[PDB]
DNA sequence: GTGACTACAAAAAAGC
RNA sequence: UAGACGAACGGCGCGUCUUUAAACCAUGCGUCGGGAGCGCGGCGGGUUCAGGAUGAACGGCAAUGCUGCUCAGCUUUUUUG
DNA sequence: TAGTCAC
């Protein structure tokens, strides 16, 4: 699927908080 | 040489080595520094704990994956406790003083 | 007896001989090492001995050496080198009286070369050693310079006494860097034979010598004529003049067949002659592995072209035709040996039977009534080789390791013989 | 479940609380059965049930009594894992010592009692006696005694006599004595004392006791009387054949000590005589010490055939200790190792995988999906179905693969790019197809290299993989500045082939609407791949804010350039490709795109460039043949003349005119000149081989020889290789390093003489051996670099600091090697930026300088601006993001939590593979002349001569930019002035290299007085000089008695009087040093500025010892005080040298060797921090006298110069940050917290002082001195005790931490690794921050 | 000053 | 052959005895099994007290049991890369 | 056998 997170970096850019919130959201 | 799940040594609960007898690829520690060079830490956690020498979690993770779950154990690894016990054993008071 | 046997069987200088290639075995036999119990360790090595001394020329090969921590210490000796009765290294030379080379040879020790001057083979001689130029280059003491014709007195024998057999095979070596020569020599060492050898197109001329001198192939001990040919043996009618009186028999040679190497490769000799044709003493009669007509042949001849193509040769990648793999000019044969043992624990002696609890009859179908496979039956991965139970009996039969899957060619069964034998034994 | 760890001694009541019972007998198992006894070592009542959820008698069967005890067997009905941890204790009849404090070199008991352990051991084994105030008047509490003295004192006093024995006596003595009076008396003594050897021990003692009183522990607890016992599982006793056991060493020692305790209990049960009391207690002492650590004192194995038994320490220290080999270095499953190849048809975010390992690795995931679809019913059914590998398994694995990235690495993980992640794509075969471009990043050739692939499990792992380890997200160099997707070898060949232009070919001169139909002509084969076609094309401009305005115009170009403009993205200028594209240029292309368009356009553009490069390079076709390497004709002729001239030079030796050495220099230089001539001839020949006519007349142009394309394109090779293969290969050096006089006149295309080849051999073996040995030292080096900078974690964004001084571009003597803009690129300013335009501020302070503010500097010609730096950050155990600078891996500023130190260490370590282990001045450019440290005197000729050896000269551009820099050797004349606009090629200074002049400062006669003739000055009228010259022999050289006044020539006026420097300093009598070669005879009128005398005077190891701070062979002494320098007295050996500051404690001298040169004179007005001697400089004094900022510049300049000499560039931020960790320690001068001089953590002292000033307003606190310490030693001095215990001297460090009541803050990295807890640096940093923010709040 | 304690894979065999 | 007992119950095994519960061993032989929770009752075990080797009471827990409700191999050495 | 530590 999606292979680049340049969009994530340019607007909500941080490589730890995004990972943890995505993990705790997809856990469900 | 490929290995997903096989036997383990009697002395230590670690897979064997080499193509023969279904060995496991050796994870050195130069690449360990390479790994903590990135911000990735969880992957280091499970590889250190369950992928190598955890036996209860290994079955638990094995039983976790089969029924559509891929969540690790949010706790302190057991090898830390027994080591702590040794420190507690000799003459020394050790504790998780700050929580 | 124990001391000598343990020295032979276990010694850090007693190395394990390499069978995969005639060139490999000859360069392993001709190896020279500065290691062993009495030398120096790899860690404590000094750079002074790592380099090439300017007196190595003519006796010590500057090319043949492995790559790695042990570099420059396991080198070999030159092709024409021979030892000295005092254990030194002594090399041939051609004496020159005034301006003519003396055809007679003369061997020279190492230190004795110090106060001497020796001409080079690349210098041309007119008709009897008369040098084409009276001012020819020469080497005296670790240096080269231009010297007068009468100044020199010794002549090098040829152009070949500077490299060894391990490196002399690589052709057109007059044009490449040392490093690539080193790598090529090492790969020549690590060659593997094929099922049918083909002659190399560009060679050196010593292939016949290296083939005949090593016993990998068959050589005619005595002259005569061929009388009977066989795919496994050779019968030679010795000539009546060549034979010595009293023993008027005829020569027999049993060619060896597919057997295990020391590096999991194959060995066999191919009879390369016919009936009704003369043979001579000291002549090749049957070709061993990776040879033809008594000439060395390691690899194969490819029609090759240099051109970039879609990145499939990105850095050193190679392309191979489905044609060549289709006609099988590269396919090899590997020999695996599996040994299964049966000890005697406290729970009774081990049994090698065929009836084992919790087994499938399909696996037993390829087996016999005692539990050992037949000869020539193909077996796949994970299958059982020989029935064995540990007496409640534990199913400790020998199984095929994964991946490897072929067909049995041979079976060997051994035991302490003075107890009993079973139907298979 | 925690965030910090504290270590301290144990309390016996607390130990009993930890325990769950008391052991009575060593009966671990009973015969005729296999069930342990209730009162034996293996007790269920104390440790738990060996049968899960069952009492021993089995009366309560795991449903009706779950968790409750059994009335018959005192064991709770629970599982077996509690038996892994549940533990008991042993109560000792008499207290025993903890032998570590006995056996430690800093014996804690001995240090606390200030008495060695010899008598202590004797009383421990009841050989000597401990007095306990045996007599109030005669002796004290801390004296040794004997039995006869015990008897003598008993008959002496009897009533007041008392002397108890052994460990109990030691405990009673130490308990009875306090620590307060001790601390006051010790602090009083250290305040007023002069001896220094005992001072260190006294400081250690007071520090230990003052830590002890704060810790709250009790020294008598140190003398333990209850010993804990470990759970039975940790002492494995598997029942062997026939009821045997493995007999673990722990069990034997426990049995021994329990038997000893039982015997002691029996002995005290009948009031036994004291003779056997001592023996029994002593034997129990050896037993308990052997159990604690056997072999340390008595080596009492007693349980084996003369082989040691692991007592307790073997499970702590030694490589058998599980710490650093069981959590550092280990196997792992769920991975595959295999050989690799190139799949040149994949996306950059993909990597191939063959079917067999794919299915083998992912079968656990297959079963989860298999049972999810329900096609298989049981695990065995799925296993046997996948055993046959039906059609369904392929499609289901394809379904599961598409979002499940995998990790990939090579064996030598040199740096950060050694590990990556990829989206798998299934392929056939048994080889790992890899994307071509990333192959450069791994530096992994396809000579047969093996890589290993690993697989994550949890969703967190997959998400962080997608976030970080996607190679798409890893484009720039973490090391210095550049994308690692720089085009590879084959691609740049085709790209260079695109941007060529012949003078005449098919399909040229016409105009084209655009690139769309342009390829149509080429695809139809009706036009050349390269011509001078004119095209009108549309481009886009980022000039508008967020909008790419379009424009178009007709332009002349080549056909291939239109093909490349087809694929170029929107917003790029056209001229970037209008030139002859090269290997270096195309890389910059990507860089420019990264600086405009972002990330996705860059990656897709690079992939498309790779595709087009392969396609057209294959379409074009260019091999290399013999006829390509054309030999220039004149080359042979050239060497002929060289040969001739060489012969001539030989005649010069043959005639005896010259010696061999100068003949050697002549011949080697002329051979080098001939090599240069032939090289330029051949490059000229190959440069313009092609001459093609166009409309009649012929005309030259750039060649299309294959080797010429591999040369000019920059794909591979260099002019050196072409010179070797084509022309003169040159003459190399013999293995000793000396150049042989015989050149090898031939090249590779022609044959070589065997002697030439043999000479060439050992040169290559040298490099091969160096490379082979290089793999060992470098990696170990990297180790020493990561240990010192193990944590270095950013914790907060900005501390508000504004320190640091003048980061400036460096001029390396000649032309500048690196300007300001790139050096300051990526940095964030601290001070506000003032343009040199009278308060016309350009950039505000505390702002990031990425490119735009850097772009604002060139036009303003600003040449010195300071920014933030890690050394100038005053945080606590951390670094500010605004104090470090921009992140290297990403264009935006660095976020929070990342471990910069590890990144810096790996970046510094990686280039080791490229590094081997082993009279006048002329201006060269046009600019203004500037002299720094102006101290000069006008000579008689009217020009200037320097009177200060520290003066330096520079060339400044007329716009203010510094262009040149040259140190002025002492006694150098001047031929120009400051501010004179002088073009290049103009000498300004003159002097002598091997002779240094000493020059008068005032005019007048020289009345030679204040020296002794013959003794001090000798009229050595040599034939060559022919005059009564003055030579001032040294004190050792001349007579001792004569050279006792420091002779000084008396320069005088017309009155013959000792004229002074007018009213200011001192007379003109200049003290002549040793060997002062003076040609003056008597009373010579010598003007000012006229000379008086003429004195006739491994990159990798460099990095290693400059990081080790090892003192060089010559420690250059320096003036650490101000005032006028002087000369000391003369001693037995190295003459003392004294200094004379104008104020303060001026009578300071120092120990100075005299055999080495001393470029110092009496009238040198030295300052605070200028060199006295010359040569290599140790870091210690540079740090200690001229501040931290100066020493940082020196080391970083040295290391970057070494790397640039190797031709490898790395950004200074990484090399600089470890330097900040280099200065992690400081000593104390004015006390108030420490004792007097505690060399300890500088950050801790600073943080203590900063609060103390605001809290204890008025207290001085502590005046400190930030001193350095070797990186190895600094690693040994880590505050994290666990990290120190990881790899060296485990037992000692844990003991010294426990006695001090240490509380490790767990702020490091190795400590998190060894415990296995989540590292609070990467993603775990926020998680730990989140846990503390939400929970425990 | 001087003596004392201490400063990467793969293959093969033994040695248990 | 069968019955009985063998640290609460039952099954089985083993040991003992022949209308005896003992013998035997001594966290009172071994293996396995009990739907749970709440409620009643208490085998067993312990505490207190007394009495002068014994007795009374007691519930923190609790056996066989009962009513109702709810719930689903390692080390060393060597060689090749 | 010398660096560091203790006598
Ligand atoms: Mg390869
Ligand atoms: Zn019980
Ligand atoms: Zn800061």
PDB file of N, CA and C in Angstrom, chain B residues 1 3-5 14 25-27 29-31 33 38-42 45 48 51 62 70 76 83 86 88-89 91 93-95 97-99, chain D residues 1-4 6 8-10 18 315 322 329-337 360 363 413 416 419 458 464 783 786 1315-1316 1318 1322-1323:
ATOM      1  N   UNK B   1      19.800 -20.962   4.268  1.00  0.00           N
ATOM      2  CA  UNK B   1      19.460 -21.505   5.576  1.00  0.00           C
ATOM      3  C   UNK B   1      18.342 -20.657   6.160  1.00  0.00           C
ATOM      4  N   UNK B   3      14.973 -20.518   9.045  1.00  0.00           N
ATOM      5  CA  UNK B   3      14.469 -21.084  10.291  1.00  0.00           C
ATOM      6  C   UNK B   3      13.375 -20.187  10.843  1.00  0.00           C
ATOM      7  N   UNK B   4      12.187 -20.754  11.033  1.00  0.00           N
ATOM      8  CA  UNK B   4      11.070 -20.063  11.662  1.00  0.00           C
ATOM      9  C   UNK B   4      10.803 -20.557  13.075  1.00  0.00           C
ATOM     10  N   UNK B   5      10.683 -21.869  13.258  1.00  0.00           N
ATOM     11  CA  UNK B   5      10.457 -22.446  14.580  1.00  0.00           C
ATOM     12  C   UNK B   5      10.970 -23.875  14.566  1.00  0.00           C
ATOM     13  N   UNK B  14      17.624 -21.367  23.633  1.00  0.00           N
ATOM     14  CA  UNK B  14      17.951 -20.663  22.408  1.00  0.00           C
ATOM     15  C   UNK B  14      18.085 -21.663  21.270  1.00  0.00           C
ATOM     16  N   UNK B  25      19.969 -18.009  12.688  1.00  0.00           N
ATOM     17  CA  UNK B  25      20.910 -16.968  12.297  1.00  0.00           C
ATOM     18  C   UNK B  25      21.301 -16.130  13.505  1.00  0.00           C
ATOM     19  N   UNK B  26      22.604 -15.926  13.677  1.00  0.00           N
ATOM     20  CA  UNK B  26      23.108 -15.237  14.853  1.00  0.00           C
ATOM     21  C   UNK B  26      22.878 -13.738  14.744  1.00  0.00           C
ATOM     22  N   UNK B  27      22.271 -13.173  15.781  1.00  0.00           N
ATOM     23  CA  UNK B  27      22.071 -11.735  15.893  1.00  0.00           C
ATOM     24  C   UNK B  27      23.199 -11.169  16.744  1.00  0.00           C
ATOM     25  N   UNK B  29      25.726  -7.698  17.776  1.00  0.00           N
ATOM     26  CA  UNK B  29      25.373  -6.490  18.508  1.00  0.00           C
ATOM     27  C   UNK B  29      25.894  -5.200  17.887  1.00  0.00           C
ATOM     28  N   UNK B  30      26.806  -5.266  16.914  1.00  0.00           N
ATOM     29  CA  UNK B  30      27.019  -4.131  16.023  1.00  0.00           C
ATOM     30  C   UNK B  30      25.697  -3.684  15.411  1.00  0.00           C
ATOM     31  N   UNK B  31      24.957  -4.631  14.835  1.00  0.00           N
ATOM     32  CA  UNK B  31      23.628  -4.315  14.340  1.00  0.00           C
ATOM     33  C   UNK B  31      22.667  -3.958  15.463  1.00  0.00           C
ATOM     34  N   UNK B  33      23.560  -1.836  17.931  1.00  0.00           N
ATOM     35  CA  UNK B  33      23.712  -0.381  17.927  1.00  0.00           C
ATOM     36  C   UNK B  33      23.063   0.224  16.695  1.00  0.00           C
ATOM     37  N   UNK B  38      18.198   4.091  15.089  1.00  0.00           N
ATOM     38  CA  UNK B  38      16.855   4.536  14.757  1.00  0.00           C
ATOM     39  C   UNK B  38      16.060   4.800  16.032  1.00  0.00           C
ATOM     40  N   UNK B  39      14.890   5.407  15.862  1.00  0.00           N
ATOM     41  CA  UNK B  39      13.972   5.578  16.964  1.00  0.00           C
ATOM     42  C   UNK B  39      13.135   4.365  17.282  1.00  0.00           C
ATOM     43  N   UNK B  40      13.314   3.277  16.538  1.00  0.00           N
ATOM     44  CA  UNK B  40      12.569   2.057  16.810  1.00  0.00           C
ATOM     45  C   UNK B  40      13.110   1.383  18.063  1.00  0.00           C
ATOM     46  N   UNK B  41      12.219   1.093  18.999  1.00  0.00           N
ATOM     47  CA  UNK B  41      12.583   0.458  20.259  1.00  0.00           C
ATOM     48  C   UNK B  41      11.780  -0.796  20.551  1.00  0.00           C
ATOM     49  N   UNK B  42      10.500  -0.822  20.168  1.00  0.00           N
ATOM     50  CA  UNK B  42       9.682  -1.998  20.435  1.00  0.00           C
ATOM     51  C   UNK B  42      10.296  -3.234  19.801  1.00  0.00           C
ATOM     52  N   UNK B  45      12.717  -4.602  21.733  1.00  0.00           N
ATOM     53  CA  UNK B  45      12.180  -5.231  22.938  1.00  0.00           C
ATOM     54  C   UNK B  45      11.761  -6.675  22.679  1.00  0.00           C
ATOM     55  N   UNK B  48      14.755  -8.997  21.784  1.00  0.00           N
ATOM     56  CA  UNK B  48      15.549  -9.319  22.963  1.00  0.00           C
ATOM     57  C   UNK B  48      14.830 -10.295  23.883  1.00  0.00           C
ATOM     58  N   UNK B  51      11.766 -13.372  21.109  1.00  0.00           N
ATOM     59  CA  UNK B  51      12.282 -14.018  19.910  1.00  0.00           C
ATOM     60  C   UNK B  51      13.502 -14.885  20.187  1.00  0.00           C
ATOM     61  N   UNK B  62       3.059 -17.421  20.214  1.00  0.00           N
ATOM     62  CA  UNK B  62       2.618 -18.435  19.261  1.00  0.00           C
ATOM     63  C   UNK B  62       1.119 -18.674  19.375  1.00  0.00           C
ATOM     64  N   UNK B  70      -1.613  -9.852  17.759  1.00  0.00           N
ATOM     65  CA  UNK B  70      -0.179  -9.612  17.640  1.00  0.00           C
ATOM     66  C   UNK B  70       0.265  -8.567  18.658  1.00  0.00           C
ATOM     67  N   UNK B  76       7.509  -6.503  32.694  1.00  0.00           N
ATOM     68  CA  UNK B  76       8.960  -6.538  32.829  1.00  0.00           C
ATOM     69  C   UNK B  76       9.459  -7.951  32.547  1.00  0.00           C
ATOM     70  N   UNK B  83      17.638 -12.381  37.834  1.00  0.00           N
ATOM     71  CA  UNK B  83      18.870 -11.638  38.071  1.00  0.00           C
ATOM     72  C   UNK B  83      18.746 -10.798  39.333  1.00  0.00           C
ATOM     73  N   UNK B  86      19.153 -12.810  42.371  1.00  0.00           N
ATOM     74  CA  UNK B  86      20.554 -13.041  42.702  1.00  0.00           C
ATOM     75  C   UNK B  86      21.122 -11.871  43.492  1.00  0.00           C
ATOM     76  N   UNK B  88      19.357  -9.855  45.256  1.00  0.00           N
ATOM     77  CA  UNK B  88      18.694  -9.980  46.548  1.00  0.00           C
ATOM     78  C   UNK B  88      19.278 -11.127  47.360  1.00  0.00           C
ATOM     79  N   UNK B  89      19.856 -12.123  46.688  1.00  0.00           N
ATOM     80  CA  UNK B  89      20.302 -13.327  47.378  1.00  0.00           C
ATOM     81  C   UNK B  89      21.564 -13.093  48.201  1.00  0.00           C
ATOM     82  N   UNK B  91      23.750 -10.330  49.631  1.00  0.00           N
ATOM     83  CA  UNK B  91      23.587  -9.565  50.850  1.00  0.00           C
ATOM     84  C   UNK B  91      22.893  -8.242  50.616  1.00  0.00           C
ATOM     85  N   UNK B  93      20.214  -5.294  49.247  1.00  0.00           N
ATOM     86  CA  UNK B  93      18.828  -4.863  49.120  1.00  0.00           C
ATOM     87  C   UNK B  93      18.679  -4.113  47.802  1.00  0.00           C
ATOM     88  N   UNK B  94      17.898  -4.677  46.888  1.00  0.00           N
ATOM     89  CA  UNK B  94      17.618  -4.052  45.604  1.00  0.00           C
ATOM     90  C   UNK B  94      16.108  -4.011  45.419  1.00  0.00           C
ATOM     91  N   UNK B  95      15.629  -2.939  44.795  1.00  0.00           N
ATOM     92  CA  UNK B  95      14.194  -2.755  44.650  1.00  0.00           C
ATOM     93  C   UNK B  95      13.918  -1.799  43.501  1.00  0.00           C
ATOM     94  N   UNK B  97      12.700   1.104  43.228  1.00  0.00           N
ATOM     95  CA  UNK B  97      12.431   2.119  44.244  1.00  0.00           C
ATOM     96  C   UNK B  97      11.474   3.193  43.737  1.00  0.00           C
ATOM     97  N   UNK B  98      11.559   3.540  42.458  1.00  0.00           N
ATOM     98  CA  UNK B  98      10.705   4.562  41.872  1.00  0.00           C
ATOM     99  C   UNK B  98       9.763   3.919  40.864  1.00  0.00           C
ATOM    100  N   UNK B  99       8.469   4.177  41.023  1.00  0.00           N
ATOM    101  CA  UNK B  99       7.456   3.617  40.137  1.00  0.00           C
ATOM    102  C   UNK B  99       6.528   4.708  39.613  1.00  0.00           C
TER     103      UNK B  99
ATOM    104  N   UNK D   1       6.905  -0.603  34.731  1.00  0.00           N
ATOM    105  CA  UNK D   1       6.491  -0.840  36.109  1.00  0.00           C
ATOM    106  C   UNK D   1       7.404  -0.105  37.084  1.00  0.00           C
ATOM    107  N   UNK D   2       8.319   0.692  36.538  1.00  0.00           N
ATOM    108  CA  UNK D   2       9.275   1.457  37.329  1.00  0.00           C
ATOM    109  C   UNK D   2      10.044   2.367  36.382  1.00  0.00           C
ATOM    110  N   UNK D   3      10.789   3.305  36.967  1.00  0.00           N
ATOM    111  CA  UNK D   3      11.643   4.180  36.180  1.00  0.00           C
ATOM    112  C   UNK D   3      13.001   4.461  36.811  1.00  0.00           C
ATOM    113  N   UNK D   4      13.327   3.860  37.954  1.00  0.00           N
ATOM    114  CA  UNK D   4      14.624   4.077  38.582  1.00  0.00           C
ATOM    115  C   UNK D   4      14.916   2.929  39.538  1.00  0.00           C
ATOM    116  N   UNK D   6      17.464   1.780  42.990  1.00  0.00           N
ATOM    117  CA  UNK D   6      18.375   2.097  44.081  1.00  0.00           C
ATOM    118  C   UNK D   6      18.944   0.811  44.663  1.00  0.00           C
ATOM    119  N   UNK D   8      21.287  -0.874  47.929  1.00  0.00           N
ATOM    120  CA  UNK D   8      21.723  -0.659  49.303  1.00  0.00           C
ATOM    121  C   UNK D   8      21.887  -2.012  49.981  1.00  0.00           C
ATOM    122  N   UNK D   9      22.492  -1.987  51.166  1.00  0.00           N
ATOM    123  CA  UNK D   9      22.653  -3.202  51.947  1.00  0.00           C
ATOM    124  C   UNK D   9      21.307  -3.649  52.517  1.00  0.00           C
ATOM    125  N   UNK D  10      21.251  -4.913  52.922  1.00  0.00           N
ATOM    126  CA  UNK D  10      20.022  -5.524  53.403  1.00  0.00           C
ATOM    127  C   UNK D  10      19.931  -5.449  54.922  1.00  0.00           C
ATOM    128  N   UNK D  18      11.643 -10.962  53.345  1.00  0.00           N
ATOM    129  CA  UNK D  18      11.833 -11.545  52.020  1.00  0.00           C
ATOM    130  C   UNK D  18      11.700 -13.060  52.066  1.00  0.00           C
ATOM    131  N   UNK D 315      28.434 -16.895  38.655  1.00  0.00           N
ATOM    132  CA  UNK D 315      27.145 -16.508  38.101  1.00  0.00           C
ATOM    133  C   UNK D 315      26.988 -14.998  37.986  1.00  0.00           C
ATOM    134  N   UNK D 322      26.010 -14.397  32.435  1.00  0.00           N
ATOM    135  CA  UNK D 322      25.021 -14.303  31.371  1.00  0.00           C
ATOM    136  C   UNK D 322      24.764 -12.879  30.902  1.00  0.00           C
ATOM    137  N   UNK D 329      24.642 -10.276  22.021  1.00  0.00           N
ATOM    138  CA  UNK D 329      25.158 -11.349  21.192  1.00  0.00           C
ATOM    139  C   UNK D 329      24.426 -12.656  21.415  1.00  0.00           C
ATOM    140  N   UNK D 330      23.636 -13.081  20.429  1.00  0.00           N
ATOM    141  CA  UNK D 330      22.731 -14.209  20.615  1.00  0.00           C
ATOM    142  C   UNK D 330      22.094 -14.646  19.301  1.00  0.00           C
ATOM    143  N   UNK D 331      21.617 -15.887  19.250  1.00  0.00           N
ATOM    144  CA  UNK D 331      20.878 -16.360  18.091  1.00  0.00           C
ATOM    145  C   UNK D 331      19.470 -15.768  18.086  1.00  0.00           C
ATOM    146  N   UNK D 332      18.762 -15.986  16.978  1.00  0.00           N
ATOM    147  CA  UNK D 332      17.353 -15.623  16.884  1.00  0.00           C
ATOM    148  C   UNK D 332      16.736 -16.442  15.763  1.00  0.00           C
ATOM    149  N   UNK D 333      15.468 -16.795  15.932  1.00  0.00           N
ATOM    150  CA  UNK D 333      14.715 -17.487  14.899  1.00  0.00           C
ATOM    151  C   UNK D 333      13.985 -16.460  14.035  1.00  0.00           C
ATOM    152  N   UNK D 334      13.084 -16.936  13.175  1.00  0.00           N
ATOM    153  CA  UNK D 334      12.288 -16.069  12.306  1.00  0.00           C
ATOM    154  C   UNK D 334      13.184 -15.192  11.431  1.00  0.00           C
ATOM    155  N   UNK D 335      14.175 -15.820  10.804  1.00  0.00           N
ATOM    156  CA  UNK D 335      15.102 -15.100   9.944  1.00  0.00           C
ATOM    157  C   UNK D 335      15.691 -16.073   8.934  1.00  0.00           C
ATOM    158  N   UNK D 336      16.268 -15.516   7.868  1.00  0.00           N
ATOM    159  CA  UNK D 336      16.915 -16.321   6.857  1.00  0.00           C
ATOM    160  C   UNK D 336      18.144 -15.631   6.298  1.00  0.00           C
ATOM    161  N   UNK D 337      19.189 -16.427   6.084  1.00  0.00           N
ATOM    162  CA  UNK D 337      20.448 -15.922   5.552  1.00  0.00           C
ATOM    163  C   UNK D 337      20.660 -16.519   4.174  1.00  0.00           C
ATOM    164  N   UNK D 360       8.327 -20.715   4.525  1.00  0.00           N
ATOM    165  CA  UNK D 360       8.870 -21.219   5.783  1.00  0.00           C
ATOM    166  C   UNK D 360       8.786 -20.170   6.883  1.00  0.00           C
ATOM    167  N   UNK D 363       4.770 -19.249   7.639  1.00  0.00           N
ATOM    168  CA  UNK D 363       3.801 -20.282   8.000  1.00  0.00           C
ATOM    169  C   UNK D 363       3.091 -20.043   9.334  1.00  0.00           C
ATOM    170  N   UNK D 413      27.645  -4.487   9.801  1.00  0.00           N
ATOM    171  CA  UNK D 413      26.778  -3.325   9.998  1.00  0.00           C
ATOM    172  C   UNK D 413      27.641  -2.156  10.461  1.00  0.00           C
ATOM    173  N   UNK D 416      24.471   3.367  10.182  1.00  0.00           N
ATOM    174  CA  UNK D 416      23.017   3.337  10.328  1.00  0.00           C
ATOM    175  C   UNK D 416      22.340   2.647   9.151  1.00  0.00           C
ATOM    176  N   UNK D 419      21.018  -1.479   8.333  1.00  0.00           N
ATOM    177  CA  UNK D 419      19.722  -2.112   8.529  1.00  0.00           C
ATOM    178  C   UNK D 419      18.656  -1.290   7.820  1.00  0.00           C
ATOM    179  N   UNK D 458       4.778  -7.671  16.231  1.00  0.00           N
ATOM    180  CA  UNK D 458       3.662  -6.875  16.716  1.00  0.00           C
ATOM    181  C   UNK D 458       3.323  -5.745  15.746  1.00  0.00           C
ATOM    182  N   UNK D 464       6.330   1.141  13.281  1.00  0.00           N
ATOM    183  CA  UNK D 464       7.605   1.848  13.352  1.00  0.00           C
ATOM    184  C   UNK D 464       8.509   1.484  12.183  1.00  0.00           C
ATOM    185  N   UNK D 783      34.007   0.654  18.882  1.00  0.00           N
ATOM    186  CA  UNK D 783      33.567   0.251  20.211  1.00  0.00           C
ATOM    187  C   UNK D 783      33.909   1.323  21.237  1.00  0.00           C
ATOM    188  N   UNK D 786      31.562   4.247  21.025  1.00  0.00           N
ATOM    189  CA  UNK D 786      30.156   4.181  21.398  1.00  0.00           C
ATOM    190  C   UNK D 786      29.998   4.112  22.913  1.00  0.00           C
ATOM    191  N   UNK D1315      18.896  -4.799  31.354  1.00  0.00           N
ATOM    192  CA  UNK D1315      17.705  -5.171  32.107  1.00  0.00           C
ATOM    193  C   UNK D1315      16.591  -5.627  31.179  1.00  0.00           C
ATOM    194  N   UNK D1316      16.678  -5.295  29.895  1.00  0.00           N
ATOM    195  CA  UNK D1316      15.629  -5.609  28.955  1.00  0.00           C
ATOM    196  C   UNK D1316      14.450  -4.664  28.970  1.00  0.00           C
ATOM    197  N   UNK D1318      12.310  -1.169  28.223  1.00  0.00           N
ATOM    198  CA  UNK D1318      12.216  -0.312  27.049  1.00  0.00           C
ATOM    199  C   UNK D1318      13.178   0.862  27.168  1.00  0.00           C
ATOM    200  N   UNK D1322      14.183   5.984  21.877  1.00  0.00           N
ATOM    201  CA  UNK D1322      13.438   5.963  20.637  1.00  0.00           C
ATOM    202  C   UNK D1322      11.954   6.140  20.873  1.00  0.00           C
ATOM    203  N   UNK D1323      11.133   5.281  20.266  1.00  0.00           N
ATOM    204  CA  UNK D1323       9.699   5.334  20.524  1.00  0.00           C
ATOM    205  C   UNK D1323       9.378   5.098  21.993  1.00  0.00           C
TER     206      UNK D1323
END
